[PDB]
Amino acid sequence: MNIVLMGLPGAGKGTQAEKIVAKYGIPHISTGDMFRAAMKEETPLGLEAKSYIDKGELVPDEVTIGIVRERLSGFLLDGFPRTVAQAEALEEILEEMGRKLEHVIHIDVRQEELMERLTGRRITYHLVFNPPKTPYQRADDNEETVAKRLEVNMKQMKPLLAFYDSKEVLRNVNGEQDMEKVFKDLRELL
Ligand SMILES: Nc1ncnc2c1ncn2[C@@H]1O[C@H](COP(=O)(O)OP(=O)(O)OP(=O)(O)OP(=O)(O)OP(=O)(O)OC[C@H]2O[C@@H](n3cnc4c(N)ncnc43)[C@H](O)[C@@H]2O)[C@@H](O)[C@H]1O
Numbered sequence: 012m013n014i015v016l017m018g019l020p021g022a023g024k025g026t027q028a029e030k031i032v033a034k035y036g037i038p039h040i041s042t043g044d045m046f047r048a049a050m051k052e053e054t055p056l057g058l059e060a061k062s063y064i065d066k067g068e069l070v071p072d073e074v075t076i077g078i079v080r081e082r083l084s085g086f087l088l089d090g091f092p093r094t095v096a097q098a099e100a101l102e103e104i105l106e107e108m109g110r111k112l113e114h115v116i117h118i119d120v121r122q123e124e125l126m127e128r129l130t131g132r133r134i135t136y137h138l139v140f141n142p143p144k145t146p147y148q149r150a151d152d153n154e155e156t157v158a159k160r161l162e163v164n165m166k167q168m169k170p171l172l173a174f175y176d177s178k179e180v181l182r183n184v185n186g187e188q189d190m191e192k193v194f195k196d197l198r199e200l201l
Pocket residue numbers: 018019020021022023024025026027042043044046063064065067068069070071075089090091092093094097128129131132133135136137140141160186187188189190191193
């Protein structure tokens with residue numbers, strides 16, 4: 012059970028991740044969560060990562076690969092690879108491990124829906140979609156920062172999708188649905 016979740020900021024990676032972990036019971040290696048853990052603990056990694064994360068940019072491939080390579084030593088990779096260079100590195104790591112990627116799952120959502128999804132997010136919950144009975148909000152979910160995140164991720168998305176689409180491991184799922192309907196489709200694949 013070796014799975015990769017990729018998707019644009021706010022597509023529903025982490026949302027589906029929790030459901031995948033609860034259903035199947037596997038490790039969940041989320042670069043985003045790892046950086047947030049590292050940032051909060053003020054480790055050297057966290058410090059140098061913070062500048063890029065707060066800017067909305069991607070942290071360099073070297074350090075991102077470093078952190079993942081060690082941490083892999085079934086699984087659910089979340090937000091990795093999100094560049095080709097990262098994916099190129101993963102292929103070697105996995106061959107070095109003796110475990111191949113069974114499925115790469117792209118959660119497809121539309122750049123318009125993402126702005127609303129990220130701004131309305133409360134941590135997950137959402138103000139209009141998954142509302143709490145009664146009423147924190149992420150630092151990088153600011154309108155201005157979200158725009159930078161979408162810009163930067165879309166650019167790296169195409170080369171990846173094409174990469175994995177050629178490999179014949181890519182599987183698109185319709186992300187623009189109810190949470191459980193999105194998960195059902197994942198179930199079908201998994
Ligand atoms: N490999 C890498 N290389 C370089 N840098 C890296 C890296 N990996 C991480 N980073 C760094 O990490 C930073 C942040 O990355 P990261 O923390 O991974 O965030 P992201 O990739 O930008 O995506 P988000 O986490 O914002 O959205 P999500 O996909 O988790 O969706 P969510 O479940 O919240 O759900 C979205 C919202 O919508 C709602 N929602 C969920 N599902 C549905 C549905 N089906 N219908 C309607 N609404 C829904 C939810 O309630 C929720 O509020 C990056 O800026 C970068 O700095």
